[PDB]
Design a protein around this nucleic acid. Structure first.
Length: 199
RNA sequence: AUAAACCGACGGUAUUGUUCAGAUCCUGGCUUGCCAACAGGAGUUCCCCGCGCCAGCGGGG
């Protein structure tokens, strides 16, 4: 597992799709299939590009558009019952089936993921996702701008929520699994990266 | 097919050498951009795949 800080040129950073496709070229294997990586956008505006915190299973190699600043080999050593700081940009949703009777490819009724617009439901979603791995001691749900994107031929939305707070570890391997694999949908759109720190 | 018809105005040639546009000059003095203002109602968020479905839960992009 490798943790890095990467910057992407503005000309290759208009949509989250462009961020994904641009970050992709740091690991040349086809088809891996991958992503074996997660990332979190901290600064969105140029120059030089957009700053990103990239967790991966390989060592990134800088390209023309994607520039690595620092790289780290890291082993998460988590102890039980220890208070920690956490940050997680996530996509809290509810899969429901459409009030409009739109049709998918199979001729059945289409489903839609909808944002949870109430704090209680978001926090409930969070502690639910964590489960027996950890218990949320304190949480700040930061409301973000709705993100839009393009490609391949579809224009869609990703409403994100940025959780920042304190938690306590109950089970370490489960939490390591949560960090490594990611939490929630839109993992390719810069969600699911759980960042931890000591207080 | 007409004072028409047939029917070259043709050949040869550096415009050349010399030349500071120079010296003098504050654009200065006087100026509030002020008065009024919840962003809140909203769970739609576009494409696949697996398992559910008076519910929905996930995995990819």
């Amino acid at each position: 597992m490798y943790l890095s800080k990467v910057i992407i040129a503005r000309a290759w950073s208009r949509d989250l799709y462009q961020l994904h496709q641009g970050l992709w070229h740091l690991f040349p294997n086809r088809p891996d299939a991958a992503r074996d990586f997660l990332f979190h956008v901290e600064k969105r505006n140029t120059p030089e590009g957009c700053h990103v915190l990239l967790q991966s299973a390989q060592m990134p190699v800088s390209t023309a558009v994607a520039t690595v600043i620092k790289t780290k080999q890291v082993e998460f050593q988590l102890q039980v019952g220890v208070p920690l700081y956490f940050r997680l940009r996530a996509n809290p949703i509810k899969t429901i089936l459409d009030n409009q009777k739109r049709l998918d490819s199979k001729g059945n009724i289409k489903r839609c993921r909808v944002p949870l617009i109430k704090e209680a439901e978001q926090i409930a979603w969070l502690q639910r996702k964590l489960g027996n791995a950890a218990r949320v001691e304190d949480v700040h749900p930061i409301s973000e701008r709705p993100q839009y994107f393009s490609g391949d031929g579809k224009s869609g939305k990703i409403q994100t929520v940025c959780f920042e707070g304190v938690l306590t570890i109950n089970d370490a391997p489960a939490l390591i699994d949560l960090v490594q694999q990611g939490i929630g949908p839109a993992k390719s759109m810069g969600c699911g990266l759980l960042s931890l720190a000591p207080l």
